[PDB]
Design a binder for this molecule. Structure first.
Ligand SMILES: C[C@@H]1CN(CC(=O)N2CC(C)(C)c3ncc(Cc4ccccc4)cc32)[C@@H](C(=O)N2CCOCC2)C[NH2+]1
Ligand code: NA
Ligand SMILES: [Zn+2]
Length: 104
């Protein structure tokens, strides 16, 4: 509902540290791995498996075990500068092509 942050500055700098993001999950019952989530820049909101990226502020939910944090981050928040710093544009293009092709 809010626009995604495409600047090089994090929307939520309180969640910029991996350890800070890790704390937000607590006991995590969900199919997708919390450390893998925190590495993809995601922190938990405390309602179901709702996560937000610390940098773009981009929010995701209803994590199937087939869904990957970095892939979902790229699918839904392609303009995220954190995503770009960590993964690079070669990775990001693959994800886009793969999912844009996945539709068939
Ligand atoms: C891990 C994947 C994510 N999918 C996309 C998803 O989660 N998106 C896409 C988008 C950007 C339109 C969206 N906007 C709002 C919410 C809620 C929200 C609000 C603040 C914080 C976190 C979550 C979620 C969401 C899931 C997906 O395909 N979904 C179909 C649509 O409804 C959500 C599930 C499947 N799992
Ligand atoms: Na929790
Ligand atoms: Zn992001």
């Amino acid at each position: 509902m809010n626009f995604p942050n495409s600047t090089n500055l994090p929307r939520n700098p309180s969640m910029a540290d991996y350890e800070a993001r890790i704390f937000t999950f607590g006991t995590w019952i969900y199919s997708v791995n919390k450390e893998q989530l925190a590495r993809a820049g995601f922190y938990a909101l405390g309602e179901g498996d709702k996560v937000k990226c610390f940098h773009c502020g981009g929010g995701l939910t209803d994590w199937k075990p087939s869904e990957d944090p970095w892939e979902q981050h790229a699918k839904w928040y392609p303009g995220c500068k954190y995503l770009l710093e960590q993964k690079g544009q070669e990775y990001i293009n693959n994800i886009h092509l793969t999912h844009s092709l996945e539709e068939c």
